[PDB]
């Protein structure tokens, strides 16, 4: 089956055992594949996004963290527990291309 992301998707991220991330264009849409439809969407970014990763079950008060870099130095942390709502953000001056968490 397909899930239409009109602007060019650049990263596919299997966060949950039931959910994925369309990480492309200015926004990013988090889908549930078991329901086969977008559970939430976040257009919280300036430039077209370029990176998104996920980390879970580690030494943190927030259990699940979602990092997303969007080509300005701007990496933003959301959380699927709070429906992918903004939790933090860093800005590095150079246009960020990649991001990774331990």
Partner 1 sequence: MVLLISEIKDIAKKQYNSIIKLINELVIPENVTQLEEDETEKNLRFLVMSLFQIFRKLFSRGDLTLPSSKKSTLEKEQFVNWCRKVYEAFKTKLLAIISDIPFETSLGLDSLDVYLQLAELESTHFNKTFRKLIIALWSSNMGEIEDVKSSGASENLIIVEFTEKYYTKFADIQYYFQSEFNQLLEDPAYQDLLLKNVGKWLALVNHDKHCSSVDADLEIFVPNPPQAIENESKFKSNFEKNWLSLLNGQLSLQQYKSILLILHKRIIPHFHTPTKLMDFLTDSYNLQSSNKNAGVVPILALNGLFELMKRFNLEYPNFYMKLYQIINPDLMHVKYRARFFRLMDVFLSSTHLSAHLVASFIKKLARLTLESPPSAIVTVIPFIYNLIRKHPNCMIMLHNPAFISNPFQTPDQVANLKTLKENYVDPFDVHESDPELTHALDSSLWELASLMEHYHPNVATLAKIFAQPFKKLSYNMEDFLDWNYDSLLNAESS
Partner 2 sequence: TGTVTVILSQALQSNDHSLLETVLNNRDERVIRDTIFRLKPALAVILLERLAERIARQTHRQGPLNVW
Partner 3 sequence: SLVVQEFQHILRLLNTNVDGNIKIVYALTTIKGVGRRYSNLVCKKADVDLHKRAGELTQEELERIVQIMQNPTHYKIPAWFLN
Which residues in this chain contact partner 1 in the complex, by CB under 8 A? Answer: 8, 46-47, 71-72, 95
Question: Cα dist. 44→54, 64, 86 in Å?
Answer: 17, 19, 8
DSSP conformation letters of 60-85: SSSSEEEEEE-SSSEEEEE-GGGTS-
Kindly tell me which residue out of 18, 34, 46, 63 binds partner 2, with binding defined by CB under 8 A.
46
Please state the closest distance from residue 90 (CB atom) to partner 3, in A. 19
Nearer to partner 2, 20 or 67 (CB): 67
Residue 29 contacts partner 2 per CB under 8 A: no
The beta-strand segments (E) located in the chain are 9-13, 19-24, 28-32, 37-42, 51-56, 64-69, 74-78, 88-91
Please state the closest distance from residue 71 (CB atom) to partner 3, in A. 7
Which tokens is 55 given?
């980390």
Stretch that binds partner 2, among 32-40, 41-49, 61-69, 77-85 (CB under 8 A): 41-49
**Residues near partner 2, by CB under 8 A:** 43-46, 70, 74, 86, 89, 91
């Amino acid at each position: 089956y397909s899930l239409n992301h009109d602007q060019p998707v650049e990263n596919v991220i299997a966060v949950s055992p039931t959910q994925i991330v369309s990480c492309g264009g200015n926004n990013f849409k988090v889908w549930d594949l078991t329901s086969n439809k977008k559970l939430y969407e976040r257009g919280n970014f300036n430039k077209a996004v370029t990176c998104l990763d996920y980390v879970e079950n580690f030494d943190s008060p927030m259990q699940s963290a979602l990092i997303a870099s969007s080509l300005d130095g701007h990496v933003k942390v959301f959380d699927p527990l709070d429906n992918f709502q903004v939790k933090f953000g860093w800005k590095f001056s150079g246009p960020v291309l990649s991001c990774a968490v331990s």
